[PDB]
Amino acid sequence: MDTKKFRGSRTCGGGTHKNRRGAGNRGGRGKAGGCKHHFVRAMMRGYSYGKHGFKRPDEVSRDVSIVNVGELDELASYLVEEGLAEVKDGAYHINLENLGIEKVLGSGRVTKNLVVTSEEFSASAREKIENAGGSCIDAE
Amino acid sequence: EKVNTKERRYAIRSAIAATTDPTLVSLRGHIFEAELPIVAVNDLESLERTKQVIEFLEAAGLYEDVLRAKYGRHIRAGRGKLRGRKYKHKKSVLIVAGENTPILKAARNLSGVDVVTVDSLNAELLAPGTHAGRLTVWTESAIGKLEGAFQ
Amino acid sequence: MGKKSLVKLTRKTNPRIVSLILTLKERANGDSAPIWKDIAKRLEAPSRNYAAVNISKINRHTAEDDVLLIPGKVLGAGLLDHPVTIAALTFSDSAFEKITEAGGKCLSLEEIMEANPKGSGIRIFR
RNA sequence: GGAGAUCGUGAGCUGGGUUUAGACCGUCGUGAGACAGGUCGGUUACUAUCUACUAGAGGUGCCCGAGGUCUGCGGGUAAGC
RNA sequence: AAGAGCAUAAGUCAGCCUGACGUUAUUCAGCAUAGCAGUGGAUGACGAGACGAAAGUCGGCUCUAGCGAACUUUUGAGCC
RNA sequence: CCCUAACUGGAGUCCGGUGAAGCUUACAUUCUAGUGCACAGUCUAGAGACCUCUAGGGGGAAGUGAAGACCCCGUGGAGC
RNA sequence: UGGGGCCCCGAAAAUUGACGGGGCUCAAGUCGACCACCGAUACCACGGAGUACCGCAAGGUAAUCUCGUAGGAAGGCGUUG
RNA sequence: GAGUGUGACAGUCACUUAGAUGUACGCCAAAAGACCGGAACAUGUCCCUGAGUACCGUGCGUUGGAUAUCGUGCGUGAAUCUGGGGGGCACCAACCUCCAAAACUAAAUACUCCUUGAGACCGAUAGCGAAAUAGUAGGGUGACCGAACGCUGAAAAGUACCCCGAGAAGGGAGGUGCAAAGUGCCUGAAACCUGAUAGUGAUGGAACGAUACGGCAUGAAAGGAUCUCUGGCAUGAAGGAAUCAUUCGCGAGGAUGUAGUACGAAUGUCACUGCCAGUGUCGUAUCUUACGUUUUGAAGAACGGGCCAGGGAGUGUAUCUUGGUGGCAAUGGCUAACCUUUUAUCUGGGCAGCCGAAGCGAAAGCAACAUGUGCGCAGCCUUUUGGCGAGGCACGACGUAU
RNA sequence: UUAUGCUAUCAGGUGGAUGGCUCGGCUCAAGAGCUUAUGAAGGACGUGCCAAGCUGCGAUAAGCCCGGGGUAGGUG
Ligand SMILES: [Mg+2]
Ligand SMILES: [Mg+2]
Ligand SMILES: [Mg+2]
Ligand SMILES: [Mg+2]
Ligand SMILES: [Mg+2]
Ligand SMILES: [Mg+2]
Ligand SMILES: [Mg+2]
Ligand SMILES: [Mg+2]
Ligand SMILES: [Mg+2]
């Protein structure tokens, strides 16, 4: 802390000099006393007792990476500029297998004909893609 | 400490822009009559004796700051002398050649004068002690190797 | 300018920001316009809450040929489909390229003050 | 006669009792051990700085210089009961 | 227990019944002001009923006490 | 012991030499009463007090020795 | 006979001592009123300092700012490098 | 032009320094040769391919290892290519993957007795305990514990000669030295002690001081010279008389007028004067029972300090959170190890990874608003009352769990 | 002529702080990395003209011999 500010104040912003002694001026060490005298602090900070649920193995569980149809529609031209997609017959042919995204969600609007191929599309993503004239193809 | 590379490069570019400014360069104790920025033709790289460096600095109007560095170089006070820091030095002239040439050995012995290639142009050379306005001498080669130096 | 404004001004370390605040309160003095005093008070705020406007809000809440002053940086998350002039503190490169391809103009607070110190039609954003 | 003076008085004394460590008796407790129960035994440290008092001196103060003889502001007494 | 409530009754008797129902949201008060556990206790909602001509009443016994975290085990329905 | 006396040797007293230690925030010539954390040389109001030195024994400095060993407390120990 | 004011007896404590002391009697005590004066850093005034907020700045306002422990915040002095 | 020494600040006086050289024994070492040989093909009722081992039961330790770590105590214990093991409880099947129980193996890595370099390090009570006659003096039977002591001067030029003294002590006189700095000798503080000067002092009351006024001594420098002392005149805020007259009041006194007069802090100006500010001590008047701490409460007969000097207490790593200032900013931000070092800097790289970008749910799994609406501050416009209105507030709609 | 004393200053003594210097220490980095029965490290004792400690050396005892460097003084 500011050492030079408290040169002269004796207690150094600590009240009694009987304060600031050891673990007894904090109520134990670590996040201790969470069932007896730090119950409310345990509730406030998330230390509250209990176990809930289970975990599947990480080798089988997988967290897919997603992107919304609004993001694809409103920067598909940036995809064609970057080289990750091209334009055939006025329909922006965009593949999800190389952009790293594996699921498509229909958050937002679709305007241009996007021929989107990906691992799995949401139902509303399929709806918004097919309303605009594009198509969805599941890619192995 | 740590500075991100983008903001460190922005700091170095800010320092490089300060070398052109006459008010800050003359506001750092640098004594000279040249008109900033002092860019030189690339013959400066290949002169191999400090007398030629002296003649160039005299011709450019920069030898006064070299003399100030040499004759103001003064003993510091305290425990610095015992630990190896006897004199307290001055910064006068900074030469930036395009590549490793014998001007690096030439003006290496100029009093308070640092010479470095454009690659080794840290911000300390461009502004020692947090103050920008070093009296820097560039060449055409440093100018041509500087279009994307820090962007 | 009181002692609190002096504290907030001296706390800033950007010479451009302090010069902008001084010139803005001078302009609000001379032109009797609270637009420049308002931008000065916004710039004198904490720099952790400075404006950072994306292209989306400017596209959504504007019209053709609108004057925008954004005390902060203009970011580039979104699309612009009409010419808007944006006088802002700083520009992202993507936002600058977006406005340039959209036909808009991207100048600074000093340039917009010189263009028209009255500030008429200057809808401030955040 | 009674009572007060740190139940006056241990840098005055004594150490008999209570209030250490040992042991015995009785009573409690499974026990270690305990008893506002008893019994036997059981270390009293200090060169007085200041103050107070008791006596003995040296100075100055008062003052022609010195000596002698007195007075009595006061203090004390139980000088007897 | 104590205090409060109640008379064409919140009492007594008789007819028919099982609302002593599954699920779920708020706000109170334990904990005024003003954080604080599982719990209650008042309003509601979804689905089912009971009694009643209907309005209504019924989320036990007129209201306020009769009870207990995490972990663990057992059990109920269907799922991961 | 009533009830103390005299005497002897060593200390002490005085002198020459040698020569430490322990208490100590400061001042300090005190006495009474009150007040003040309810036990004051220093406060308040009075009364006394010229200063210095020597000897005396210990009234006071809640005299000095010493983070109470009795009692309590410590989510402190040890032995049994 | 009743209701009142002041005073008296009831009324004895331990180092000599406390209306603060001297002392005071149509008061220097008590009661009902009154006059004039004394007496603070309060109040008023003058000059000055600091602070709070506002003003671009000069500067403006403050009867409605100035005490301060635990503590928070801000600005400075000093040593060595 | 890194420094160090040199009778004081040294690029040019010396050692040096950048740079060139020499170098025996050893260390590495490529060309040029000799030495053994290696790799496939087809072949099949053929042969070999690690045992108290793999594995299993039970106990214990250990581990994050959970019915799913490794170890090993006891017991058991195989198969041989048509074979055996693994794929986080076991068994069956598919699929994938490997060959144990025998053995060797540089480099990248770790440490510092030692060598060299460097330092926002310490500067002698610090830094090693030791600026080393230091693990020494000293302490302990022993395991072991453990200091203090640095500085003459440029050059000894380290005091000749004489006197006192018993004196190779010491003192005076005298000299060397710019200077005694005169042998643990550079500067040389305070405590403590001795002497002198000033004030006071044997009639005197104590937190030792603060404020005002005087006596005595000082007041050279650094402080004043319209400054110090003493008066007149002008303007004078707040306040405001004395005396006299009238009238009231039992009286002390009040009211009215004189009079808001004369005066009055201070601000200017003119004479007048040479001291004043200050310092030391003493006296007089008023006020204060010290400091820190524990305390509801301290001068406490509560605790700490005899005095003086020096030393002596919010520091680092990792991690989480938030402020001030900045960089970059959904086409996001940062890079970590590491490479580049021309010796720790630095420049250019380093997309692994972390956070943000989509949440809800234990899990499978599913997956949203690029504003549909109302109000409205700053701000802009405006018949100055309204309009538009970023951010803000309140709904509506939607994702998912129950 | 007031002693014992009190306070302030000054001179001197005792003392060794402050200041200045420093061949030591600490920390970090870079190299190099074993030795010993062919008798080590460590220790005891001896060892100098006058030499007590430390250091070096071992009855050849602060030393002996040989090749290289250096060259005018040496005798820790
Ligand atoms: Mg507390
Ligand atoms: Mg006694
Ligand atoms: Mg105690
Ligand atoms: Mg407790
Ligand atoms: Mg405070
Ligand atoms: Mg050199
Ligand atoms: Mg040391
Ligand atoms: Mg307190
Ligand atoms: Mg100190």
Structure description:
- The PDB classes it as ribosome.
- The entry lists the keywords Archaea, Methanosarcina acetivorans, 70S ribosome, ribosome.
- The entry is titled "Cryo-EM structure of Methanosarcina acetivorans 70S ribosome".
- Chain A: Large ribosomal subunit protein uL15.
- This is part of a larger assembly, with chains A (about 140 residues), B (about 150 residues) and C (about 130 residues).
- Chain A has helices at about 40-45, 70-75, 75-80, 125-130, and strands at about 65-70, 85-90, 90-95, 105, 115-120, 120, 135-140.
- By secondary structure, chain A is an alpha/beta fold.
- A four-stranded mixed β-sheet of chain A has the order 2-3-5-7, covered by helices on one side. Chain A has a three-stranded parallel β-sheet with strand order 1-4-6.
- Chain B has about 150 residues and is α/β, with parallel strands linked by helices.
- Chain B is built from seven helices and six strands, in the order ααβααβββαβαβα.
- By secondary structure, chain C is an alpha/beta fold.
- In chain C, helix 2 packs antiparallel against helix 3.
- The radius of gyration of chain C is 14 Å and the shape is globular.
- The structure holds magnesium ion (9 copies).
- Chain C binds six RNA strands through helix 1, helix 2, helix 3, strand 1 and helix 4.
Task: Produce a short descriptive summary.
This is part of a larger assembly, with chains A (140 residues), B (151 residues) and C (126 residues). Chain B is of the alpha/beta class and 151 residues long. Chain B is built from seven helices and six strands, in the order ααβααβββαβαβα.
